[PDB]
């Protein structure tokens, strides 16, 4: 099970339009190419991945890769492996402003919902059209924010002490005292999500908007319970689903700086697992038993060459890592 990687170029934003930024990214099939504005003479570097999403224009274009395309490409495939019983993960990596959340959460407003909102809807919908009767499900969600090696229960604002990430002698890492709520409908789960997104570190310098030096981890513990029409035992399947929103790149955020090391290591294959909490919490989902996929968002702007390239490179290695 080799990690699957996809990159995505968004449309110009407020900053870029001011600087009259030219676009340096081009896409064709499964390949992305970036140009060096400083060195327009040499030949642009190319990159081939599982998916190169071109979303620089708008939904009116025939070649715009909408939230539906992304979801159905990776989302529907991971939620699957989740049903086949595997643990799964999807995380958005990249420079801040490149589009990491939009690919994950997006804007509920009219079909803009991203990977998380859509995955849940898909799950709860699958669970329901299951008119079988030997099948019983359960779904428990958790949402947290990891800023400064500090875990924050985004669904229990009442608590302000940073939750302690611990290692179980026999079961692995887990965040002590972390909300784990059962959800019976997508209407119920959608709500919680709405909450957590808000409860997010207000922080400033970001304009008083969900500052992003921390990771928004969205865990979905899906439980399948099959009944054996004879012996009254129930085969219980259990798969964990993590949907991460990594703080921007740009370059302390140990976690990010550490995930790179692991990524690279995984690409060179022991690992500085405990070196960071993000990794530690995603021990398996990162390099253990589970199928992982990363979505690297990319700024089209020429003013972000050194940060767009970098992302292409970290995305590049990720392609290798195999679980
Ligand atoms: N694929 C996309 N289509 C349209 N707008 C996008 C896309 N990706 C990013 N954006 C725009 O950029 C803004 C920020 O993107 P965001 O999800 O916050 O990225 P980040 O991962 O950098 O935090 C949003 O307000 C959104 O309108
Ligand atoms: Mg975001």
CA torsion 258→162→218→165, rounded to 10°? 60
- Counting atoms of ligand 1 from 1, which one is nearest the CA of 67? 1
DSSP class of residue 84 equals T
DSSP class of residue 301 equals B
From the number of C-beta atoms within 10 Å of its C-beta (0-12, 13-18, 19+), residue 8 rates as buried
Domain that holds residue 166: 1-323
Q: Which experimental method was this entry solved with? A: X-ray
Active-site residue flag, 97: yes
CB 75 within 8 A of CB 121: no
Residues with CB under 5 A from ligand 2 (ion): 101
- Counting atoms of ligand 1 from 1, which one is nearest the CA of 245? 21
| Cα–Cα distance list, 113 to 110, 121, 140, 241 (Å) | 8, 10, 21, 18
CA distance 144 to 146: 7
Mapped onto helix, strand or coil, the DSSP state of residue 270 is coil
CA distance 311 to 304: 10
CB 262 within 8 A of CB 320: no
198 assigned to a ligand binding site: no
CB 241 within 8 A of CB 119: yes
Q: Which of 4, 142, 186, 245 is catalytic?
A: 245
What's the reported resolution, in angstroms, to a tenth?
A: 2.5
Nearest CA to ligand 1 atom 9: 99
Helices and strands (DSSP H and E) totals, the chain: 10, 14
DSSP class of residue 2 equals B
Q: Count the neighbouring beta carbons within 10 Å of the beta carbon of residue 313.
A: 14
Active-site residue flag, 93: no
97 lines ligand 1 (CB under 6 A): yes
98 lines ligand 1 (CB under 6 A): yes
Q: Please tell me the distance between residue 242's alpha carbon and the centre of ligand 2 in angstroms.
A: 16
Residue 57 is part of a domain; what is its CATH number?
A: 3.40.850.10
Q: Which of 55, 101, 142, 239 is catalytic?
A: 101
Looking at all shown ligands, the one closest to residue 200's CA atom is 2
- Counting atoms of ligand 1 from 1, which one is nearest the CA of 65? 1
295's enclosing H/E stretch is strand 291-298
Query: Across-strand partners of 226?
Result: 135, 235
Active-site residue flag, 195: no
Q: Please tell me the distance between residue 100's alpha carbon and the centre of ligand 2 in angstroms.
A: 5
Strand order in the sheet with 31-34: 25-28, 31-34, 45-48
CB 37 within 8 A of CB 305: yes
Q: Closest Cα partner for 214 from 264, 145, 166?
A: 145
Buried b (16+ CB within 10 A) or exposed e, 142-163: bbbbbbeeebbbbbbeeeeeeb
Active-site residue flag, 102: yes
- Counting atoms of ligand 1 from 1, which one is nearest the CA of 8? 1
Handedness of CA 278, 281, 298, 114 (dihedral sign): negative
- Rounded to 5 degrees, φ, ψ at 256 are -55, -50
Q: Which tokens sit at 61? A: 């274009």
DSSP class of residue 322 equals B
CA distance 317 to 31: 15
As for how many domains the chain has, the answer is 1
Q: Count the neighbouring beta carbons within 10 Å of the beta carbon of residue 167.
A: 11
CA distance 278 to 149: 8
Q: Which tokens sit at 218? A: 């969205």
98 assigned to a ligand binding site: yes
Contacts of 52 (CB under 8 A, 6+ apart): 6, 7, 8, 27, 28, 29, 30, 31, 32
Angle at 107 between CA 128 and CA 318, to 5 degrees: 85
Mapped onto helix, strand or coil, the DSSP state of residue 248 is coil
Long-range contacts of 129-138 (CB under 8 A, 24+ apart): 133/227, 134/226, 134/227, 134/228, 134/229, 135/224, 135/225, 135/226, 135/227, 136/224, 136/225, 136/226, 136/227, 136/234, 137/222, 137/223, 137/224, 137/225, 138/182, 138/222, 138/223, 138/225
Q: Please tell me the distance between residue 100's alpha carbon and the centre of ligand 1 in angstroms.
A: 7
92 assigned to a ligand binding site: no
Q: Which of 102, 105, 113, 300 to mutate to test the pocket of ligand 1 (most atoms within 8 A of CB)?
A: 102
Q: Please tell me the distance between residue 9's alpha carbon and the centre of ligand 1 in angstroms.
A: 10
Do strands 45-48 and 165-168 pair parallel, antiparallel, or not at all (unpaired)?
unpaired
CA distance 283 to 54: 32
């Amino acid at each position: 099970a080799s990690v699957k990687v996809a990159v995505r170029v968004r449309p110009f934003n407020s900053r870029e339009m001011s600087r009259d930024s030219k676009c340096i990214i081009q896409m064709s099939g499964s390949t992305t190419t970036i140009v060096n504005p400083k060195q327009p003479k040499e030949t642009p570097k190319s990159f081939s991945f599982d998916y190169s999403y071109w979303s620089h224009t708008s939904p009116e274009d025939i070649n715009y890769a909408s939230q539906k395309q992304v979801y159905r490409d990776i989302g529907e495939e991971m939620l699957q492996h989740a049903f086949e019983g595997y643990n799964v993960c999807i995380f958005a990596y990249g420079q801040t402003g490149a589009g990491k959340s939009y690919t994950m959460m997006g804007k509920q407003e009219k079909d803009q919902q991203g990977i998380i909102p859509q995955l849940c809807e898909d799950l709860f919908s699958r669970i329901n059209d299951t008119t079988n009767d030997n099948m019983s499900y359960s779904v428990e969600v958790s949402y947290m924010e990891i800023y400064c090696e500090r875990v924050r229960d985004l669904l229990n604002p009442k608590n302000k002490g940073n939750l302690r990430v611990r290692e179980h002698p026999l079961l692995g890492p887990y965040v002590e005292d972390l909300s784990k709520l059962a959800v019976t409908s997508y209407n119920d789960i959608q709500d919680l999500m709405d909450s957590g997104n808000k409860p997010r570190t207000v922080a400033a310098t970001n304009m008083n908007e969900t500052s992003s030096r921390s990771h928004a981890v969205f865990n979905i513990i899906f439980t399948q319970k099959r009944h054996d029409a004879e012996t009254n035992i129930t085969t219980e399947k259990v798969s964990k689903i993590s949907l991460v929103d990594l703080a921007g790149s740009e370059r302390i955020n140990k976690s990010l700086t550490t995930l790179g090391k692991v990524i690279s290591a995984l690409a060179e294959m022991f690992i500085p697992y405990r070196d960071s909490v993000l990794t530690w919490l995603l021990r398996e989902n990162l390099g253990g038993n589970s199928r992982t996929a990363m979505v690297a968002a990319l700024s089209p702007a020429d003013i972000n060459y050194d940060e767009t390239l970098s992302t292409l490179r970290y995305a590049d290695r990720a392609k290798q890592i195999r679980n």
